[PDB]
Amino acid sequence: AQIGPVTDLHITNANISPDGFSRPAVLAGGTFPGPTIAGNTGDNFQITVFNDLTDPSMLTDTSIHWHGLFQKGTNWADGPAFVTQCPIITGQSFDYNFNVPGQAGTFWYHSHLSTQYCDGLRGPFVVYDPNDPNASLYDVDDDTTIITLADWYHTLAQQEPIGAAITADATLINGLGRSFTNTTASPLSVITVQSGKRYRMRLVSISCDPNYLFSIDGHDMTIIEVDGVNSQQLTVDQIQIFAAQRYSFVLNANQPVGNYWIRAQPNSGGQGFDGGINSAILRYEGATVEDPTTTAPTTFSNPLVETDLHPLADLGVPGQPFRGGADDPLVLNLAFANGRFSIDGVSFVPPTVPVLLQILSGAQNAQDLLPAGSVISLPSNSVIEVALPAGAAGGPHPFHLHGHNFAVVQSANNATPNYVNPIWRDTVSIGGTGDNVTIRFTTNNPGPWFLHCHIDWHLEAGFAIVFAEDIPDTASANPVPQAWSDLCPAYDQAH
Numbered sequence: 001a002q003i004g005p006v007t008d009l010h011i012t013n014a015n016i017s018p019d020g021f022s023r024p025a026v027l028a029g030g031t032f033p034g035p036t037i038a039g040n041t042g043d044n045f046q047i048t049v050f051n052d053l054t055d056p057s058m059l060t061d062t063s064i065h066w067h068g069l070f071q072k073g074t075n076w077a078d079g080p081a082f083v084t085q086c087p088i089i090t091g092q093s094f095d096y097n098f099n100v101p102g103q104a105g106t107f108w109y110h111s112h113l114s115t116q117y118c119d120g121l122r123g124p125f126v127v128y129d130p131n132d133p134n135a136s137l138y139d140v141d142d143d144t145t146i147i148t149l150a151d152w153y154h155t156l157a158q159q160e161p162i163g164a165a166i167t168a169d170a171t172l173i174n175g176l177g178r179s180f181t182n183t184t185a186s187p188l189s190v191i192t193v194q195s196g197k198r199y200r201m202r203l204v205s206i207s208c209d210p211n212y213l214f215s216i217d218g219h220d221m222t223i224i225e226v227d228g229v230n231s232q233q234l235t236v237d238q239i240q241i242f243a244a245q246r247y248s249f250v251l252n253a254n255q256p257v258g259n260y261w262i263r264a265q266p267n268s269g270g271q272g273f274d275g276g277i278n279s280a281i282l283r284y285e286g287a288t289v290e291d292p293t294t295t296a297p298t299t300f301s302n303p304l305v306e307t308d309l310h311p312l313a314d315l316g317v318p319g320q321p322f323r324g325g326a327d328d329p330l331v332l333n334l335a336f337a338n339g340r341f342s343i344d345g346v347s348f349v350p351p352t353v354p355v356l357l358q359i360l361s362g363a364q365n366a367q368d369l370l371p372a373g374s375v376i377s378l379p380s381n382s383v384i385e386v387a388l389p390a391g392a393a394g395g396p397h398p399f400h401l402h403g404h405n406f407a408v409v410q411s412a413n414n415a416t417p418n419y420v421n422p423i424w425r426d427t428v429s430i431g432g433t434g435d436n437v438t439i440r441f442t443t444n445n446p447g448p449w450f451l452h453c454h455i456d457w458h459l460e461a462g463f464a465i466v467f468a469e470d471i472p473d474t475a476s477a478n479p480v481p482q483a484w485s486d487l488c489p490a491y492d493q494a495h
């Protein structure tokens with residue numbers, strides 16, 4: 001069952017064994033992934049998050065971000081700890097009360113405190129469109145058509161040893177999968193389809209790190225949505241999906257009744273599918289209950305290439321059709337050395353006072369805001385360009401901007417910009433050495449918006465800045481409830 005748009009959401013510790021290995025976790029709604037939060041476009045979400053965490057090994061504070069939702073006028077509800085709020089302390093609750101005007105698509109929610117979402121606090125968030133322009137492309141779109149891709153670790157996120165390479169221990173598809181080492185034949189997820197029907201599969205990367213090469217043996221996938229943005233139909237046979245991205249694709253159940261492997265190959269961790277790792281099962285109604293016997297091709301015929309995506313709507317690109325053709329054109333120097341990432345020479349370390357509270361308390365320029373050098377002001381009502389040249393270790397880095405989606409004027413692995421009809425999205429791979437992935441957006445959403453690599457380990461190691469968008473209108477735009485105002489004093493008192 002989906003929950004919302006008005007719902008409680010309990011955050012608890014529990015043991016889970018999604019790949020046959022038991023470990024404690026941080027869960028929303030008692031499950032991994034958490035329950036799907038859903039509503040319709042324009043709805044008022046009121047998600048009362050109950051922090052019932054007691055195991056300090058995964059942090060007993062929490063804060064939840066609603067990934068991809070713009071939070072216009074509700075910056076305080078965005079969730080990134082020490083950017084828009086202090087964490088919720090254990091035994092307390094907090095009502096994230098916001099609206100979703102002008103958005104409809106596939107989103108997700110996750111802890112936004114430290115690396116806590118890796119420990120399990122992640123789930124889908126769907127804003128349905130009663131008049132979806134893509135509605136006539138499919139027959140079924142419901143909780144059974146959401147596909148989550150997750151990395152899963154046997155070591156707790158706070159306990160990953162300093163200086164050891166972090167890699168996952170399993171890929172989980174809809175919460176189930178098999179471990180890369182000491183593989184046991186634990187249950188695989190089954191996605192069931194009826195021959196002849198067409199399904200809106202909502203593919204959600206809830207990854208903390210790896211990108212996945214996602215495919216379904218025997219089937220093609222017609223992309224119709226990218227990170228909440230409706231796209232023209234683009235048929236592919238493989239999707240490389242980076243952390244935090246979403247796609248909807250139409251799956252036409254047009255193959256012989258049978259079982260077909262669903263594949264999600266991460267870029268690190270276990271390679272291949274031995275023992276049924278990196279796998280789930282697409283089962284047609286009437287098929288025998290047994291594992292697929294299909295194989296992947298050696299080479300996919302039509303992998304997704306981001307430049308092939310185009311918005312369904314005439315979204316264009318703001319600004320002028322050349323590099324620097326913006327009101328505020330930025331080029332960030334993204335670097336890694338010695339275990340720390342930096343942006344323009346500053347490694348992000350969260351401040352004591354949330355950025356939003358600093359602004360509300362009177363800090364009125366970015367030089368007043370902490371962390372020093374980590375907060376960049378953006379002028380209001382302006383076209384922003386941000387070039388994100390890659391090269392920093394650990395890539396490809398999926399950069400994500402809160403509060404906004406953006407035109408992807410230049411994509412990974414292709415030096416040619418597109419000032420005409422690029423896809424808009426909210427999380428973008430910045431590609432490889434020499435690339436110059438570049439985004440554009442207009443600043444019509446006052447508040448401090450995080451920009452960071454969505455590889456959670458990289459965020460934790462400093463790969464972030466805050467855009468303090470329209471500082472002058474931030475307080476007026478984002479009236480705060482008393483309960484928000486109460487968070488920092490409670491947090492700081494609890495220590």
Ligand SMILES: *[C@@H]1O[C@H](CO)[C@@H](O[C@@H]2O[C@H](CO)[C@@H](O)[C@H](O)[C@H]2NC(C)=O)[C@H](O)[C@H]1NC(C)=O
Pocket residue numbers: 323324329330331387389434435436438
């Ligand atoms: C990525 O594109 C940006 C522009 O969007 C390039 O930035 C320019 O860099 C040149 C030379 O380094 C400067 O003289 C310009 O002033 C920069 N433009 C802006 C808006 O600052 C950048 O060089 C490109 N990077 C890569 C690696 O191709």
Ligand SMILES: *[C@@H]1O[C@H](CO)[C@@H](O[C@@H]2O[C@H](CO)[C@@H](O)[C@H](O)[C@H]2NC(C)=O)[C@H](O)[C@H]1NC(C)=O
Pocket residue numbers: 305307308414415416417418419
């Ligand atoms: C590299 O990216 C460019 C820009 O997005 C792609 O160029 C577009 O190609 C389409 C499809 O042929 C044309 O209709 C557009 O006119 C092109 N736009 C520009 C600005 O050149 C190009 O296809 C991408 N390369 C690959 C190999 O996919």
Ligand SMILES: [Cu+2]
Pocket residue numbers: 065067068110244400454
């Ligand atoms: Cu996110």
Ligand SMILES: [Cu+2]
Pocket residue numbers: 065066067068400401402403
């Ligand atoms: Cu986000």
Ligand SMILES: [Cu+2]
Pocket residue numbers: 394395396397398453454455458459463
């Ligand atoms: Cu990264």
Ligand SMILES: [Cu+2]
Pocket residue numbers: 065080112400402450452
């Ligand atoms: Cu974030």
Ligand code: NA
Pocket residue numbers: 316317318319320419
């Ligand atoms: Na334009």
